[PDB]
Amino acid sequence: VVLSFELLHAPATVCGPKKSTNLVKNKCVNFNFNGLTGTGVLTESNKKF
Amino acid sequence: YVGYLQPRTFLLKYNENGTITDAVDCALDPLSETKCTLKSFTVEKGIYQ
Amino acid sequence: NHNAQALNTLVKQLSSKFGAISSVLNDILSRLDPPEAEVQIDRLITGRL
Amino acid sequence: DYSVIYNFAPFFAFKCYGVSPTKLNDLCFTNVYADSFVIRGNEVSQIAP
Numbered sequence: 001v002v003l004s005f006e007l008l009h010a011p012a013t014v015c016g017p018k019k020s021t022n023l024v025k026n027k028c029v030n031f032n033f034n035g036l037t038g039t040g041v042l043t044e045s046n047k048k049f
Numbered sequence: 050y051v052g053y054l055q056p057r058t059f060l061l062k063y064n065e066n067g068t069i070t071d072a073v074d075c076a077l078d079p080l081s082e083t084k085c086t087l088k089s090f091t092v093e094k095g096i097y098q
Numbered sequence: 099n100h101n102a103q104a105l106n107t108l109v110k111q112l113s114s115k116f117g118a119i120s121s122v123l124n125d126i127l128s129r130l131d132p133p134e135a136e137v138q139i140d141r142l143i144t145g146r147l
Numbered sequence: 148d149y150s151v152i153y154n155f156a157p158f159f160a161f162k163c164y165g166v167s168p169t170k171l172n173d174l175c176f177t178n179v180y181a182d183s184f185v186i187r188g189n190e191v192s193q194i195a196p
C-alpha cells in the first residue's frame with residue numbers, strides 16, 4: 001500500500017492528532033497554524049483577504 | 050467565446066488592496082519581455098539585454 | 099540601487115533549495131529524521147555560505 | 148491516526164522516502180494518495196524511486 005502525499009505549506013487535509021491552543025496576540029510565540037510552523041508576534045490585520 | 054490556454058509566463062501587478070490590476074505576457078513582444086526582465090511596467094530609455 | 103540589489107539577492111537565495119527537499123529548515127526538521135536532516139541541512143548551509 | 152497501521156502485521160518492507168516513519172503524525176499533508184496492489188516478493192524492490 002503506497003501512500004503518496006505532498007507536504008507543501010500543509011494547507012488542509014490529513015492533519016493528524018490535533019491538540020489545539022487558545023490564540024494569543026501581541027506576544028512572541030511559537031505558532032503551528034495548519035501545518036505552517038513559525039515564531040513571531042500576531043496582530044489583528046487590516047489586510048483584505 | 051472560446052479560447053485555449055497555453056504555458057506562459059505572466060507578470061502580475063497587485064494593487065494596494067490586494068487585487069490584480071494589470072499583467073504582462075512575456076512572450077507577446079520584445080517590450081513585454083524587457084518588462085519581464087526588469088520586473089517593471091515602465092521601461093526607461095536604453096538598450097536592455 | 100546597487101546596495102539594494104545586493105541585499106535583495108541575499109534574501110532571494112534564502113528561498114533556494116540548493117538540492118535540498120525544502121528551503122525552510124523548520125520543514126526539514128519537522129519532517130525528517132536527524133540522519134537525513136543532516137544531509138539536507140548540509141546542502142542548505144553550503145549554498146547559503 | 149496511525150495506531151492501527153502500526154498495529155497491523157509486521158511489515159516486510161516499510162520505507163518512507165521523504166518523511167519520517169515516526170513524524171508522519173505531527174505534519175499536515177496536502178492531498179493524500181493511497182495505492183494498493185499485490186506483487187511478488189522480489190518485485191517489491193522494483194517499487195522504489
Ligand SMILES: *[C@@H]1O[C@H](CO)[C@@H](O)[C@H](O)[C@H]1NC(C)=O
Pocket residue numbers: 064065066067070
Ligand atoms: C483598492 O481598495 C481601496 C479601498 O476602498 C480603494 O479605495 C482603491 O481605489 C482600490 N484600488 C484601486 C486601484 O481602485
